[model samples]
Target: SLNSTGLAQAAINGLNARFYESSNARWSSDEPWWISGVALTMVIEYMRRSGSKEYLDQVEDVIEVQRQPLSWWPSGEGEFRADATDDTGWWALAMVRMYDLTGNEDYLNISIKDEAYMRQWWTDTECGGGLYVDIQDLTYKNAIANELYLKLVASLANRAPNATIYLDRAQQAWTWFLGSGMINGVNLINDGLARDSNTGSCYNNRLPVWTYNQGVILGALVELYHATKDESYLLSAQAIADAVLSPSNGLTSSSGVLTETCEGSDSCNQDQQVFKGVFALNLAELGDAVAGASSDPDAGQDYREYLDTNMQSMYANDRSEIVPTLFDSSTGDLYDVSWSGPFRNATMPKQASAIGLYVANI
Candidate 1:
């Protein structure tokens, strides 16, 4: 009875009330542009699946604000710069989705410019070649930044005006990423590589494996599969999904709940709070990639089951229901960020994660 469609509809309804401003048409008057990018992308995906145009006007307004003079979205800092390559990549992916959904050339152009900005962060001075977290802070070549770059270029390989260049860039980034020692022995991705000051060599920080670092690359590989019809890409994506489902240190709990390690410390920051949703979202995208494949026919179905179980766990653990009420409205329908816990503070990113979970399963 607690289906993704119904729960997603309720969650989106609550989000519009608390976060979205119909008049100004922005997600959280105070949240940064990249956060809005995340929320808006979820909204777009929801609309695409539900065939609901209730928020299309708001969607257009959000798109208008994202149109920046230099970068993809506002840097949320002092001036316009390519500092946040990861943020820019989020907008690029959103723009590409918009182009696909609406067939708008302007959206495609925006994606192109965003891709160019992301390229500014790429450098060969590091380990082989990868991207920095920010242009100024060049010491850390992060997994999320490189993952976004790979996803953007790979998506562009199919949607951009110039396909060949993106294809080549996607392959190049993928090869370097595989060899960059980001993927640990367990097949899960680590945080990033930090540059050593003395020897000028980059090494893996071995930071705690976040759910998001395991997430976006799945989409990148799926896009690569779409662009090149490569069976290897699908195999790699399946491997990542399998790793995420592994019993030890994976994204799930023994009881089948989708839990992140950050929740254990009560330290899930704004960005980190929403990471598991990214994993689920891209896993669903991976499902799409394997839908018609003969190599792993059950791969997609297994992922769907994983998502469904997570959603069921989330609903079963609902306390306030202040997020979205599947059936009970006594406490209201509120989905907590912890998935199975003490009901952390509700923020825009957390809501984005909730919506992402619903949409991913749907």
Candidate 2:
């Protein structure tokens, strides 16, 4: 029932709340390297959809406040930013998406102009030709970056024409992840579901689910589907949705899903549950409601209902209702400030972004 504007607002509120956290105002704020970039895209997308310049002004402010670094490269400090290439790749998306919405030449031109330096850095870190998963700290040959790269470059590819070159590069990275990131031959694993780059020991530990990862992949697959119109893309997206809902039906056997009671991880991990759910919702929306009259009968109504019910239940706690919150399932905690806050917190921004994507080239 919550619409696009609602989702975007939640994201914005979360961004603001996180920034204003009493512990670390901007003065001491350790804004994740890619936070401004990713968050900025979400804001800009919403503004475009709402036709509200206020959101755009807010973004200009965010850019001004954070532009001191000017390089658009995140100073990696967080677990996610460990991969320098992906970090910048995600940051680059902010620039690309902002440009798409505003047509501001400099916004994307700067990133395009800096492409050489960025690519050199991306290549220099590789051992033979394989990308070093993390650039800030050589942790692992991470699949996360591979997926993120596809999104960042593909975003710019639309208008830049030449930027379309990353298309193949992004696909190659995807191949690596698909071939390497599986666990138990069923689900996706962290660090490519292989050995930690430093430890060399297999990361048998359960992988955390990242919401943005799911969202990006959904977006990517949708793009691919647009390019090819093959059932494979829709099928792939459907499979991910299935995998995400598997724990409930015994279709999936992920330990993390089994172990946690909340949509978020017990340890406050971001990708714990909401990421996959949202991706499922995104995929569903892409197929049924947003896509121009899907061929599949269930594509629109069934898909939306399925994704909505699952996602809502993940965060909701209505005992009478069939949908259960993560707390009731594996983890006992509610989707609160730790993880659910940002998601539900800025609902308008989130919805705004989704609405735009739903209608874009679909």
- Which numbered prediction scores highest in lDDT against the true structure? 1
lDDT of 1 by residue, 1-362 (tens): 87787788777766776677766657786767677777778888888877777777778887775464434433532122245778677777887777777787988887778777778768887687997876766667889989988998999899876899999999999999999888988888989987778987777788989898898999999999999988999998888889888777657788777777887777777778678878888888888778877666664788888888888777666424453367734332456687777664567777788888889987
205, model 2: CA deviation in Å? 7.7
lDDT of the candidates, in the order given: 0.78, 0.46
Candidate 2 residue runs with Cα over 4 Å from true position: 1-31, 70-83, 110-118, 121-130, 181-184, 187-189, 193-211, 228-231, 249-265, 269-285, 288-290, 300-303, 310-362
lDDT of 1 at 162: 80
In terms of TM-score, the best-performing candidate is 1
Worst 10 residues of 1 by lDDT: 72-81
